[PDB]
Amino acid sequence: QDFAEIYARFSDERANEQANRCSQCGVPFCQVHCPVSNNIPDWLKLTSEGRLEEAYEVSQATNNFPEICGRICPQDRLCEGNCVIEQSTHGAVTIGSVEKYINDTAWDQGWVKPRTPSRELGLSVGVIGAGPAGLAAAEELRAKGYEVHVYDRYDRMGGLLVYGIPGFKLEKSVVERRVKLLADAGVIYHPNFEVGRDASLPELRRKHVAVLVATGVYKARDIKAPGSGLGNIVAALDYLTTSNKVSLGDTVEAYENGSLNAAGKHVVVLGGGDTAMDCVRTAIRQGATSVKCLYRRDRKNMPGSQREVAHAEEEGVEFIWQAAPEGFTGDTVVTGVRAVRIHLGVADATGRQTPQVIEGSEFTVQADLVIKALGFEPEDLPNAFDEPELKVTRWGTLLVDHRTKMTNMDGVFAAGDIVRGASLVVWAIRDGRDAAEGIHAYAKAKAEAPVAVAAE
């Protein structure tokens, strides 16, 4: 119970040791493997020299949220995955760690990030949602020299980085540092505006050159039915934020006097991905005696990368986990106005590999608390309505061109989780990155000024 930096990756100045270790390889695989295409050889060489500012600059240029990504990026899946040194005994370089460290010193310095001189100045541009995607898009646009406002539904900013990813993994001051750097650009953020009844694309059309839809996947998945927190049930959407608010100081002005959620007795967390593992770990934070992570699918196909699963494992969370098919939750039993247990059916994979649930075999797992980890999705109809005319795919998500990230409407762009195509902070920042050039091309055209092609 308490939120210390659990990350294995975190490095002290000792990061110097690994920096020297890095081969500083040509046409490095790691960079090619990085979504934002960070120049890892150069920033690393820099830390080796000890000039943290230089590495920080290199990092920030490619990604606006270099700090958060250094801490959060599933590197094994990403840049470290193609690290050459992996062949060696020592193993791959922890690029994420060095990125965090270099970034951290920069934070300490307190330097502000200046604007480049000028460009097609900027008809109002609006971005919806304060998360990684919008922040990245907004900062690049501002680099271009435009006037932009981000409308955020919540009082807090930072998106999932603030709301859900645990403090032990992601300190809040980190997200605050990046937003401030963006702010120096002059990007304005206003907190209690929502794309919905209040704001809509047509409303924006009333004077607004372009819009970026950054809102992510606001809601969580279905089976629990009306179940209440008092009873026991909490969706990741509910649970993570409450822990976040109590745990992270800058996030909200109000002190959650309520304090951390009281979680007592056995906790069942349902989900394979990052969300489930974070909720499992956060649960112990709030006093859970035991935590069970239940997967529909087999152990082999756990969604989260090994580093994060490692945190839960060290933690001693139990994984009841077997067969590709679903240990699937049939029902939650509540007695005494409190959840006593959850009923599951065993599932197993056939040659078809299509999942099968075998009704005959059931498991009654006793649990005081259930947190549903399955994931998130857009479903709020007024929100969707806000989006018109923009075309939605049969995934019920806004369609966008992969390259331009332009929506059916030329003026509107979208990026991040909302696109449903990537589920990582660095891809979301990348989405905004790519979008910014295109919004730029579009606006400049309005200006009647050309953009090369190369983009830069």
Place this chain on the structure above:
Amino acid sequence: NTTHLDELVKTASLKGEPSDMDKAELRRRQQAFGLTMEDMELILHPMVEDGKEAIGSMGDDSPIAVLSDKYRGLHHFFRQNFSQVTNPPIDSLRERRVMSLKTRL
């Protein structure tokens, strides 16, 4: 009767190989001819440090300069000739004393 302008030339080197560009310039010229870091790190460096040439490995799987996307200098299109069966190549290390680089004006 020949003027070996060798010593006369070495003299001035020891007297100071001079530099006159400010890093702000260096970089932009370099940029003109698309130079890079690989270029300074991989290749230029070992020449200065070791007095020798970047050895490396695996094939060359970049495109062929004409088909390249990026600026590539004339010399990339000029491939070096070597001899195969007709004649034998020489050992410039073990047999350096027979070779030579004397230049006359």
